[PDB]
Structures are given as structure tokens and as C-alpha cells.
């Protein structure tokens, strides 16, 4: 029964139309993929030494937000569950940065690109930092001046966007339905009239305005959701969608297993 109609696809942003599914389901999918998509991001920042004007905590934080290519994270076990003593390369991807400036003039600009992967459960395409392009320098982590050296020994792990907002693969989920308010679920504030004040949505042409003589439908329901996804780049939007669906599926499957096992 469920349908799908992608309107504009891309690496990051997906602008589709989902219809013929319970609004509860669309909302829960949005929520789960905003919150319950396992990913990879910096977890333990071990600073061998620092000489910058930025507090060590400040850098550890800035690293916490750096998006990590996590296309194979699904293979990586949870560091909580992995049986290895301390961390292992099958439950942890080690990245190290060691940048420096020399000379009495100018200012260096350490970027995300300078990050480097030391190990990782290869060849799983995990650990690499994301970039818009190849020459796109990217995220700015700091600025260095004469004699100032920065050295760090980062660590990442597999956590979920619940435990922090760095594990969020989703950036901004658009979401709406009934662009003409057929179901009337919203009452429109106004000073003179509803129609001559409120500008129309961008999906205005996608559903025909109600006819002037049209009367209310008390059995009507929400049917067509237009949800435009976007990502930081840590995972492809299609991967986001499929992984969210898979996670929700396995979660319900776990619940059903619990139900049956209880007896």
C-alpha cells in the first residue's frame, strides 16, 4: 500500500513525497532517523600537548562535531559490547592530527582535511572525514601563529544521536501535509481574512485548492506527506532513509521477540 515519489534527489538533500501511510508512521520515521541512526564521531580526544590560545576542552568539543564518513559503521560493533580489552581496531577507529606553524609572520589555519586515519577495521569505508570536494579545505579547527604547535590523538566510536547531537546524521528535516488546510487541523489567525495575509506554501500546486462550495469531510485523514531530508554528508540521504527504516524494523522485531519470549 505505501507509495513513494522522489521529487528532487541528490547526494545530501532528498525532496520526496510520501503518501498512503499513517501520519504516526511518517512522524516516527522522521524522529527515528533524526535520533536513532548509528554513526561514527570523535569520542576520546587525548592531547599529547597543546600551545594554542584555545582551551583544550574547546578543541575536544570542536572535534566532537566533525562529521566522519560512516558508510560502513553498520558493521562496527558497539564499543560497549565489544569484548576486547581496552579498545580494538574492530570497535574503534583511531584518527590523529599533528599540525604546526613555523616562522614569525603569517597565520596557519588547521583544517579538517589535515586530520588523518591511523587505523580502523579496514577496508570498511569508515573514519575518513567528509568533504564537499577534493580541494575544499573544509572545516576550520583553529589558527596557529609563530611557534604554536597542536598535537592530538583522537578516537571515535559508535554512538547514537540520542546520546549526543554529534551522532545526528540528519541536519534539517522539512515536513508538511495538506498545504491548503483541507483537514483544517490549523485555524488561521488574521486581521482581515485568512487568504489575503498568509502566503502559500511551495507545494501549493501539488494539491488543488478546495472548491468554494466544497463542504467538510469528517472522515478525511492526512494522506500525503512531503518531507525534504538533508544530511551533513556523513551518510548518503538514501542510506539515511534505508538505515532508519531498518533500525525501526529491527526495533519492532526485538519488541515482538520479547513478547513471544515472555511466555
Amino acid at each position: 500500500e505505501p507509495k513513494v515519489n522522489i521529487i528532487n534527489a541528490q547526494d545530501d538533500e532528498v525532496e520526496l513525497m510520501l503518501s498512503d501511510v499513517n501520519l504516526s508512521l511518517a512522524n516516527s520515521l522522521r524522529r527515528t532517523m533524526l535520533a536513532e541512526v548509528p554513526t561514527l564521531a570523535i569520542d576520546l580526544v587525548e592531547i599529547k600537548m597543546n600551545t594554542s590560545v584555545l582551551a583544550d576542552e574547546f578543541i575536544s568539543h570542536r572535534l566532537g562535531l566533525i562529521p566522519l564518513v560512516s558508510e560502513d559503521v553498520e558493521e562496527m560493533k558497539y564499543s560497549r559490547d565489544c569484548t576486547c580489552e581496552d579498545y580494538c581496531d574492530e570497535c574503534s577507529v583511531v584518527l590523529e592530527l599533528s599540525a604546526r606553524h613555523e616562522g614569525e609572520e603569517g597565520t596557519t589555519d588547521v583544517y579538517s582535511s589535515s586530520l588523518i586515519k591511523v587505523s580502523g577495521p579496514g577496508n570498511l569505508n569508515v573514519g575518513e572525514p567528509v568533504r564537499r570536494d577534493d580541494y575544499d579545505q573544509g572545516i576550520l579547527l583553529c589558527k596557529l601563529r609563530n611557534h604554536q604547535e597542536l598535537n592530538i590523538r583522537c578516537i571515535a566510536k559508535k554512538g547514537i544521536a540520542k546520546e549526543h547531537a554529534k551522532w545526528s546524521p540528519c541536519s534539517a528535516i522539512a515536513f508538511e501535509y495538506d498545504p491548503h488546510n483541507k483537514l483544517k487541523h490549523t485555524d488561521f489567525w488574521f486581521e482581515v481574512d485568512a487568504k489575503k495575509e498568509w502566503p502559500d506554501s511551495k507545494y501549493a500546486t501539488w494539491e488543488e485548492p478546495p472548491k468554494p462550495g466544497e463542504v467538510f469531510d469528517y472522515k478525511a485523514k492526512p494522506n500525503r506527506f512531503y518531507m525534504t531530508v538533508e544530511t551533513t554528508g556523513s551518510l548518503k540521504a538514501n542510506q539515511v532513509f534505508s538505515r532508519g527504516i531498518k533500525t525501526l524494523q529491527e526495533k519492532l522485531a526485538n519488541v515482538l521477540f520479547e513478547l513471544e519470549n515472555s511466555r
Binding site: 570523535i42 576520546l44 580526544v45 583544550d56 568539543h61 549526543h164
Partner: protein
């Protein structure tokens, strides 16, 4: 055993709690200790 660093010339040295508190190399009277060696951690959160 207890290194230091000048605030004017930024050259490292040490003292044994008996030398007067002065920079050995430039004579400046403001110094700082240097970072320990045990390992520093952050959760990046």
C-alpha cells in the same frame, strides 16, 4: 626535574628550589611551570 618557561624570552630551564626566582637566560622575574607528562583526556562532549 621541575622544568620552567620564561614569560619574556620563552627559553626553558629548571631550578632546585634554592636558586633565586629569576630567568637564567634573560633574567626576567616572571615564569611558569610546564605541562605534566601524565596523559590528558577529553570526551569531546
Amino acid at each position: 626535574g621541575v622544568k620552567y618557561t620564561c614569560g619574556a624570552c620563552a627559553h626553558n630551564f629548571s631550578l632546585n628550589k634554592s636558586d633565586p626566582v629569576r630567568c637564567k637566560e634573560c633574567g626576567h622575574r616572571v615564569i611558569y611551570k610546564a605541562r605534566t607528562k601524565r596523559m590528558i583526556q577529553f570526551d569531546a562532549r
